[PDB]
Design a protein around this motif. Structure first.
Motif, PDB file in Angstrom:
ATOM      1  N   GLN A 177       0.832  -1.183   0.000  1.00  0.00           N
ATOM      2  CA  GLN A 177       0.000   0.000   0.000  1.00  0.00           C
ATOM      3  C   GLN A 177       0.871   1.239   0.000  1.00  0.00           C
ATOM      4  O   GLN A 177       1.766   1.385   0.837  1.00  0.00           O
ATOM      5  N   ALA A 178       0.592   2.134  -0.942  1.00  0.00           N
ATOM      6  CA  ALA A 178       1.270   3.406  -0.991  1.00  0.00           C
ATOM      7  C   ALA A 178       0.394   4.432  -0.289  1.00  0.00           C
ATOM      8  O   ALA A 178      -0.831   4.377  -0.390  1.00  0.00           O
ATOM      9  N   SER A 179       1.022   5.371   0.413  1.00  0.00           N
ATOM     10  CA  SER A 179       0.305   6.505   0.992  1.00  0.00           C
ATOM     11  C   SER A 179       1.136   7.766   0.828  1.00  0.00           C
ATOM     12  O   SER A 179       2.302   7.695   0.429  1.00  0.00           O
ATOM     13  N   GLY A 180       0.524   8.912   1.122  1.00  0.00           N
ATOM     14  CA  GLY A 180       1.155  10.204   0.948  1.00  0.00           C
ATOM     15  C   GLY A 180       0.813  10.784  -0.410  1.00  0.00           C
ATOM     16  O   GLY A 180      -0.345  10.746  -0.841  1.00  0.00           O
ATOM     17  N   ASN A 181       1.830  11.301  -1.091  1.00  0.00           N
ATOM     18  CA  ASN A 181       1.645  11.964  -2.379  1.00  0.00           C
ATOM     19  C   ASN A 181       1.647  10.991  -3.571  1.00  0.00           C
ATOM     20  O   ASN A 181       2.571  10.967  -4.384  1.00  0.00           O
ATOM     21  N   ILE A 182       0.570  10.211  -3.642  1.00  0.00           N
ATOM     22  CA  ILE A 182       0.332   9.172  -4.646  1.00  0.00           C
ATOM     23  C   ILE A 182       0.557   9.644  -6.078  1.00  0.00           C
ATOM     24  O   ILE A 182       1.075   8.896  -6.910  1.00  0.00           O
ATOM     25  N   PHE A 183       0.169  10.883  -6.356  1.00  0.00           N
ATOM     26  CA  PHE A 183       0.282  11.467  -7.691  1.00  0.00           C
ATOM     27  C   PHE A 183       1.730  11.549  -8.194  1.00  0.00           C
ATOM     28  O   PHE A 183       1.970  11.722  -9.383  1.00  0.00           O
ATOM     29  N   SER A 208       0.181  -6.819 -10.203  1.00  0.00           N
ATOM     30  CA  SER A 208      -1.038  -6.127 -10.589  1.00  0.00           C
ATOM     31  C   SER A 208      -1.249  -4.970  -9.623  1.00  0.00           C
ATOM     32  O   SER A 208      -0.492  -4.810  -8.665  1.00  0.00           O
ATOM     33  N   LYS A 209      -2.279  -4.166  -9.876  1.00  0.00           N
ATOM     34  CA  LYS A 209      -2.537  -2.980  -9.060  1.00  0.00           C
ATOM     35  C   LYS A 209      -4.031  -2.750  -8.873  1.00  0.00           C
ATOM     36  O   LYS A 209      -4.854  -3.166  -9.702  1.00  0.00           O
ATOM     37  N   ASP A 210      -4.371  -2.099  -7.764  1.00  0.00           N
ATOM     38  CA  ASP A 210      -5.717  -1.601  -7.532  1.00  0.00           C
ATOM     39  C   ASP A 210      -5.608  -0.116  -7.233  1.00  0.00           C
ATOM     40  O   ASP A 210      -5.264   0.277  -6.114  1.00  0.00           O
ATOM     41  N   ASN A 211      -5.901   0.699  -8.243  1.00  0.00           N
ATOM     42  CA  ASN A 211      -5.773   2.148  -8.150  1.00  0.00           C
ATOM     43  C   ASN A 211      -6.597   2.746  -7.008  1.00  0.00           C
ATOM     44  O   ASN A 211      -6.100   3.589  -6.256  1.00  0.00           O
ATOM     45  N   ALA A 212      -7.842   2.291  -6.880  1.00  0.00           N
ATOM     46  CA  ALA A 212      -8.741   2.762  -5.839  1.00  0.00           C
ATOM     47  C   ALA A 212      -8.200   2.500  -4.428  1.00  0.00           C
ATOM     48  O   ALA A 212      -8.498   3.249  -3.497  1.00  0.00           O
TER      49      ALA A 212
END
Length: 119
Positions: free
Chosen positions: A23-29, A70-74
């Motif tokens: 899981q990524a958090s913070g400035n995802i963009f 794989s990824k889950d953007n949401a």
């Protein structure tokens, strides 16, 4: 900046399956490419799988056909689905993320998660 947190590691019998999560958090963009590295006892850290924002993937030959990234953007999370595990997959697995403002290198690392495959 960005933080990466791995989970889903543990102990599995040879031939079994395991799904890692990052899981990524913070400035995802700020995140561009992401990937999974591993470091077996004694060995150097190696790139195992990578994914771009659009979904292009790549794999080391040693895991190709057995592992899926794989990824889950949401959910801001990337996965490593590890099937048909062998004792040689035993390693600390690390999540990694490229920063879009510094392409071609790892910008952010997770703390690593232990995967042990028993014989």
């Amino acid at each position: 900046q960005v933080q990466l947190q791995e989970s889903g590691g543990g102990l599995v019998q040879a031939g079994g399956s395991l799904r890692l999560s990052c899981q990524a958090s913070g400035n995802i963009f700020r995140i561009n490419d992401m990937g999974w590295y591993r470091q077996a006892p004694g060995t150097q850290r190696e790139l195992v799988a990578a994914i771009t924002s659009g979904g292009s993937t790549k794999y080391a030959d040693s895991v190709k056909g057995r592992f899926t990234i794989s990824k889950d953007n949401a959910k801001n999370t990337v996965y490593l689905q590890m099937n048909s595990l062998k004792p040689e997959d035993t390693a600390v697995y690390y999540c990694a993320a490229e920063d879009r403002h510094r392409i071609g290198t790892v910008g952010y690392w997770g703390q690593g998660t232990q995967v042990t495959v028993s014989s």
